Design a protein around this motif. Structure first.
Motif, PDB file in Angstrom:
ATOM      1  N   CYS A   1     -12.932  15.881  -2.610  1.00 61.05           N
ATOM      2  CA  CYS A   1     -12.645  15.701  -1.202  1.00 61.05           C
ATOM      3  C   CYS A   1     -11.933  14.364  -1.012  1.00 61.05           C
ATOM      4  CB  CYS A   1     -13.956  15.816  -0.430  1.00 61.05           C
ATOM      5  SG  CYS A   1     -13.830  16.593   1.208  1.00 61.05           S
ATOM      6  N   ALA A   2     -10.598  14.419  -0.947  1.00 63.63           N
ATOM      7  CA  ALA A   2      -9.756  13.235  -1.032  1.00 63.63           C
ATOM      8  C   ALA A   2      -9.518  12.629   0.345  1.00 63.63           C
ATOM      9  CB  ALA A   2      -8.451  13.624  -1.651  1.00 63.63           C
ATOM     10  N   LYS A   3      -9.589  11.295   0.424  1.00 56.90           N
ATOM     11  CA  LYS A   3      -9.499  10.581   1.688  1.00 56.90           C
ATOM     12  C   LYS A   3      -8.334   9.601   1.721  1.00 56.90           C
ATOM     13  CE  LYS A   3     -14.514  10.955   1.856  1.00 56.90           C
ATOM     14  NZ  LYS A   3     -15.781  10.343   2.323  1.00 56.90           N
ATOM     15  N   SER A   4      -7.616   9.470   0.615  1.00 54.77           N
ATOM     16  CA  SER A   4      -6.493   8.557   0.559  1.00 54.77           C
ATOM     17  C   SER A   4      -5.498   9.095  -0.453  1.00 54.77           C
ATOM     18  CB  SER A   4      -6.956   7.199   0.158  1.00 54.77           C
ATOM     19  OG  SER A   4      -7.255   7.199  -1.232  1.00 54.77           O
ATOM     20  N   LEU A   5      -4.241   8.691  -0.339  1.00 52.07           N
ATOM     21  CA  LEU A   5      -3.243   9.201  -1.258  1.00 52.07           C
ATOM     22  C   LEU A   5      -3.627   8.830  -2.691  1.00 52.07           C
ATOM     23  CD1 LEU A   5      -0.452  10.441  -1.884  1.00 52.07           C
ATOM     24  CD2 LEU A   5       0.538   8.220  -1.340  1.00 52.07           C
ATOM     25  N   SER A   6      -4.248   7.661  -2.879  1.00 47.21           N
ATOM     26  CA  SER A   6      -4.645   7.239  -4.215  1.00 47.21           C
ATOM     27  C   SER A   6      -5.651   8.222  -4.804  1.00 47.21           C
ATOM     28  CB  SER A   6      -5.186   5.840  -4.221  1.00 47.21           C
ATOM     29  OG  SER A   6      -6.255   5.724  -3.303  1.00 47.21           O
ATOM     30  N   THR A   7      -6.713   8.511  -4.057  1.00 52.40           N
ATOM     31  CA  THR A   7      -7.711   9.442  -4.546  1.00 52.40           C
ATOM     32  C   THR A   7      -7.090  10.817  -4.777  1.00 52.40           C
ATOM     33  OG1 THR A   7      -8.482   9.750  -2.261  1.00 52.40           O
ATOM     34  CG2 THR A   7      -9.723   8.260  -3.622  1.00 52.40           C
ATOM     35  N   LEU A   8      -6.191  11.236  -3.895  1.00 55.65           N
ATOM     36  CA  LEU A   8      -5.556  12.528  -4.043  1.00 55.65           C
ATOM     37  C   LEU A   8      -4.800  12.592  -5.361  1.00 55.65           C
ATOM     38  CD1 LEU A   8      -5.017  15.151  -2.486  1.00 55.65           C
ATOM     39  CD2 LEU A   8      -2.793  14.217  -1.911  1.00 55.65           C
ATOM     40  N   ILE A   9      -3.991  11.578  -5.630  1.00 57.08           N
ATOM     41  CA  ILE A   9      -3.219  11.586  -6.855  1.00 57.08           C
ATOM     42  C   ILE A   9      -4.157  11.535  -8.050  1.00 57.08           C
ATOM     43  CG2 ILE A   9      -1.656  10.241  -8.262  1.00 57.08           C
ATOM     44  CD1 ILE A   9      -0.346   9.353  -5.607  1.00 57.08           C
ATOM     45  N   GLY A  10      -5.179  10.683  -7.955  1.00 58.92           N
ATOM     46  CA  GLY A  10      -6.124  10.522  -9.044  1.00 58.92           C
ATOM     47  C   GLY A  10      -6.700  11.868  -9.468  1.00 58.92           C
ATOM     48  N   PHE A  11      -7.191  12.633  -8.505  1.00 60.68           N
ATOM     49  CA  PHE A  11      -7.773  13.918  -8.826  1.00 60.68           C
ATOM     50  C   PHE A  11      -6.728  14.835  -9.457  1.00 60.68           C
ATOM     51  CE2 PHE A  11      -8.971  18.287  -7.821  1.00 60.68           C
ATOM     52  CZ  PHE A  11     -10.228  18.330  -8.382  1.00 60.68           C
ATOM     53  N   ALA A  12      -5.551  14.923  -8.860  1.00 55.87           N
ATOM     54  CA  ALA A  12      -4.529  15.816  -9.382  1.00 55.87           C
ATOM     55  C   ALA A  12      -4.206  15.474 -10.833  1.00 55.87           C
ATOM     56  CB  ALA A  12      -3.308  15.732  -8.527  1.00 55.87           C
TER      57      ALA A  12
ATOM     58  N   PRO B   1       0.828  -1.207   0.000  1.00 57.42           N
ATOM     59  CA  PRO B   1       0.000   0.000   0.000  1.00 57.42           C
ATOM     60  C   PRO B   1       0.863   1.258   0.000  1.00 57.42           C
ATOM     61  CG  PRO B   1       0.356  -0.589   2.261  1.00 57.42           C
ATOM     62  CD  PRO B   1       1.311  -1.381   1.383  1.00 57.42           C
ATOM     63  N   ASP B   2       0.306   2.392   0.426  1.00 57.71           N
ATOM     64  CA  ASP B   2       1.128   3.501   0.875  1.00 57.71           C
ATOM     65  C   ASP B   2       2.085   3.935  -0.240  1.00 57.71           C
ATOM     66  OD1 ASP B   2       1.886   5.433   2.610  1.00 57.71           O
ATOM     67  OD2 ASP B   2       3.071   4.114   3.933  1.00 57.71           O
ATOM     68  N   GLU B   3       3.397   3.962   0.016  1.00 58.42           N
ATOM     69  CA  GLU B   3       4.349   4.436  -0.975  1.00 58.42           C
ATOM     70  C   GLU B   3       4.288   3.615  -2.271  1.00 58.42           C
ATOM     71  OE1 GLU B   3       8.083   6.287   0.147  1.00 58.42           O
ATOM     72  OE2 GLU B   3       9.140   5.201  -1.451  1.00 58.42           O
ATOM     73  N   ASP B   4       3.767   2.378  -2.231  1.00 59.46           N
ATOM     74  CA  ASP B   4       3.532   1.614  -3.450  1.00 59.46           C
ATOM     75  C   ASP B   4       2.622   2.389  -4.393  1.00 59.46           C
ATOM     76  OD1 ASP B   4       4.990  -0.684  -2.613  1.00 59.46           O
ATOM     77  OD2 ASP B   4       3.258  -1.262  -1.370  1.00 59.46           O
ATOM     78  N   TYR B   5       1.524   2.909  -3.848  1.00 58.22           N
ATOM     79  CA  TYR B   5       0.635   3.770  -4.603  1.00 58.22           C
ATOM     80  C   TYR B   5       1.421   4.883  -5.303  1.00 58.22           C
ATOM     81  CZ  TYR B   5      -2.707   1.992  -0.999  1.00 58.22           C
ATOM     82  OH  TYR B   5      -3.442   1.210  -0.143  1.00 58.22           O
ATOM     83  N   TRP B   6       2.301   5.559  -4.557  1.00 65.72           N
ATOM     84  CA  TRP B   6       3.080   6.667  -5.080  1.00 65.72           C
ATOM     85  C   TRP B   6       4.077   6.189  -6.139  1.00 65.72           C
ATOM     86  CZ3 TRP B   6       3.687  12.024  -4.178  1.00 65.72           C
ATOM     87  CH2 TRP B   6       4.862  12.574  -4.719  1.00 65.72           C
ATOM     88  N   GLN B   7       4.886   5.183  -5.787  1.00 69.67           N
ATOM     89  CA  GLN B   7       6.021   4.776  -6.604  1.00 69.67           C
ATOM     90  C   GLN B   7       5.544   4.131  -7.898  1.00 69.67           C
ATOM     91  OE1 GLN B   7       9.354   5.103  -6.405  1.00 69.67           O
ATOM     92  NE2 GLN B   7       9.960   5.215  -4.263  1.00 69.67           N
TER      93      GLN B   7
END
Lengths: 198, 198
Positions: A65-76, A1-7
């Motif tokens: 309204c982002a609740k997880s790093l995944s959703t945050l990145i998705g929107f951006a 999870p977590d940084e996996d989403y990012w990387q």
């Protein structure tokens, strides 16, 4: 999870420590306002910090309204594409007076995300419009060097005329009003803008 | 020949188009200003001499006079080490009026090289002291984006008080005075400074 989403998206980049901080499960809001012509090398800024936002958070489907790093990145990325970086201010704990070292133009396309005060990781994210963002490196009175994000609204509408008057003795429509963002904000910016010449 | 000499030192990097040009076998901006005039939205109307005032604004240990790209690099690295970039101004051919779009601090360590007006590649190169260099992105009247180097001197002495006063109506020793460099100058700057907060 977590940084996996990012990387997965930006491999061989870490989460930057500011963002990494904000993603953990009161604050300060800078209250100072200024004109664009006050962003210059050697400007002395005395920063006023509040434990509470104004009635408007300054004044703020183009909102989310982002609740997880995944959703945050998705929107951006859905608004800017993948070639972007997140930035945030780094005001230092009890410092008040700073000198501006330089001012870097980040353009008028960006997404801003404000970390809400819940225990849970929650951000309110929106695009900017009629606004130019800047990165403003500064040195504090104690000698430490850091940087803050500034936002200049040039469609100088959509705000309490009262505070424009309070702070700048001016009313809407006339001139560009600028202010800083707090360390709890994240702003996503295209890499094109950042590189500038380089 | 040239790219060999260069890529020996900085492989996987071309000579920048500015520098590459100056190494082939003149105008000077007369305009002077205070550092509080370097801000987003400032308008400059650039005044160009055919000739500046006696010396810059036969090249008879901090000074050198270079004939070839090899010697030029040698000197620069001699003073700053290897991790450096050359920059130059890029004022555009008949544009007069520019708006400043940001200001980037390049610090106080640099080597400055002036291409002499001789028929062949000769540069007078020297270190700088008591001086801050800046890179200044600008948009011209015709809409093109470019950038210029600005230099601000703190040690305001060793300046013609007459001209200083003519331009800024102020006296040596007091307060720091700035001007731009012409397209014919090269300035070498450490990579750290450029990278800044990034």
């Amino acid at each position: 999870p977590d940084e996996d989403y990012w990387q997965a998206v930006w491999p061989n980049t870490p989460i930057p420590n500011t963002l990494k901080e904000l993603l953990k499960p009161d604050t300060q809001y800078p209250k100072t306002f200024f004109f664009e012509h006050e962003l210059f090398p050697g400007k002395k800024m005395n920063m006023k910090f509040s434990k509470i936002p104004f009635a408007q958070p300054y004044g703020v489907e183009d909102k989310y309204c982002a609740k997880s790093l995944s959703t945050l990145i998705g929107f951006a990325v859905s608004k800017l594409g993948k070639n972007i970086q997140p930035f945030s201010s780094s005001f230092l704990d009890k410092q008040t007076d700073y000198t501006i070292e330089g001012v870097h133009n980040l353009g008028d396309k960006a997404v801003m995300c404000h970390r809400l005060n819940f225990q849970s990781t929650v951000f309110y994210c929106h695009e900017i419009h009629g606004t130019t963002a800047y990165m403003v490196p500064m040195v504090a009175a104690d000698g430490r060097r850091t940087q803050a994000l500034a936002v200049c609204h040039h469609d100088t509408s959509g705000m309490n005329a009262e505070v424009l008057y309070e702070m700048l003795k001016i009313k809407p429509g006339t001139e560009t009003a600028c202010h800083f963002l707090g360390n709890k904000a994240v702003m996503w910016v295209p890499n094109m803008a950042v590189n500038s010449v380089y």
